[PDB]
């Protein structure tokens, strides 16, 4: 997280760390949605340009973490992937359209004070919350500068930008399945996700029922916290039908 802040313990109990078995390293962020499902970006598992194409047995999921590198005994829990599911219509070739994937843990993880799932939104939630100006929150253990690594989980609250501004910030064809967030150059404040953060959650707390809902997944960005650039996120709700069908098809 560029221009973020140190997370408080249990502030983001649904935060997941995609961890490479060998070499042991951070791959991306991810989120706990149920006791057997972790949500992340499809590009964390498959992105041919960067030569990325992981299989279940290549990854470990580390849940309950706060510290970046330290194995937090008695606090975190590490799970193995049973099956990975990537959106059948995810466009890695062109613009990372439908950048989302699900990972089914080999066995359910026990919730605790540091491990707890995030709610996925429904039509009405997305409707009332996903509006330009509204601040969501992004968290991660990735780069603190576009071009070090943090010691602890970082957090930054970023406002949702208008579709027009997003489109007018890049040459990439933006789709309805995406939204961008971040502060404008004149807005004073700044902040953004960065390498190591992708696949992670963009959550908002509903002022109606006080729950945290994941509206977005850190998808892509040009650099990290640049003037005039924005972070792009997978529109979680627009693809919930794919999430529902997958979970109530092979899920538990």
């Amino acid at each position: 997280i560029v221009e973020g802040s140190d997370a408080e313990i249990g502030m983001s109990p649904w935060q997941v760390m995609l961890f490479r078995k060998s070499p042991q390293e951070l791959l991306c962020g991810a989120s706990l949605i149920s006791d057997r499902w972790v949500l992340t970006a499809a590009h964390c598992l498959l992105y041919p340009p960067w030569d990325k194409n992981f299989t279940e047995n290549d990854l470990l999921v580390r849940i309950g973490k706060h510290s970046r590198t330290r194995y937090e005994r008695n606090i975190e829990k590490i799970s193995m992937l049973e099956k990975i599911y990537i959106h059948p219509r995810y466009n890695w070739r062109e613009n990372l359209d439908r950048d989302i994937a699900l990972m089914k843990l080999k066995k359910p993880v026990a919730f605790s004070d540091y491990i707890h799932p995030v709610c996925l939104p429904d039509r009405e939630t997305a409707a009332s919350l996903l509006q330009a100006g509204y601040k969501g929150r992004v968290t991660g253990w990735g780069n603190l500068k576009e071009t070090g690594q943090p010691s602890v989980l970082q957090v930054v609250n970023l406002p949702i930008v208008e579709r027009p501004v997003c489109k007018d910030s890049t040459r990439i064809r933006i789709t309805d399945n995406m939204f961008c967030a971040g502060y404008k150059p004149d807005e004073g404040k700044r902040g953004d996700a960065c390498e190591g953060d992708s696949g992670g959650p963009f959550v908002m707390k509903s002022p109606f029922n006080n729950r945290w809902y994941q509206m977005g997944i850190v998808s892509w960005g040009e650099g990290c916290d640049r003037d005039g650039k924005y972070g792009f996120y997978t529109h979680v709700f627009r693809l919930k039908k794919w999430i529902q069908k997958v979970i109530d098809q092979f899920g538990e």
Partner: peptide, 27 residues
């Protein structure tokens, strides 16, 4: 889930974190 989005260390015990008010103030 019927317990999703309710954090043990905060909501569950009616404690609010350092920056959440900044979110709700933008709605």
């Amino acid at each position: 889930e019927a317990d999703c989005g309710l954090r043990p260390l905060f909501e569950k015990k009616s404690l609010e974190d350092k920056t959440e008010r900044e979110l709700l103030e933008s709605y």
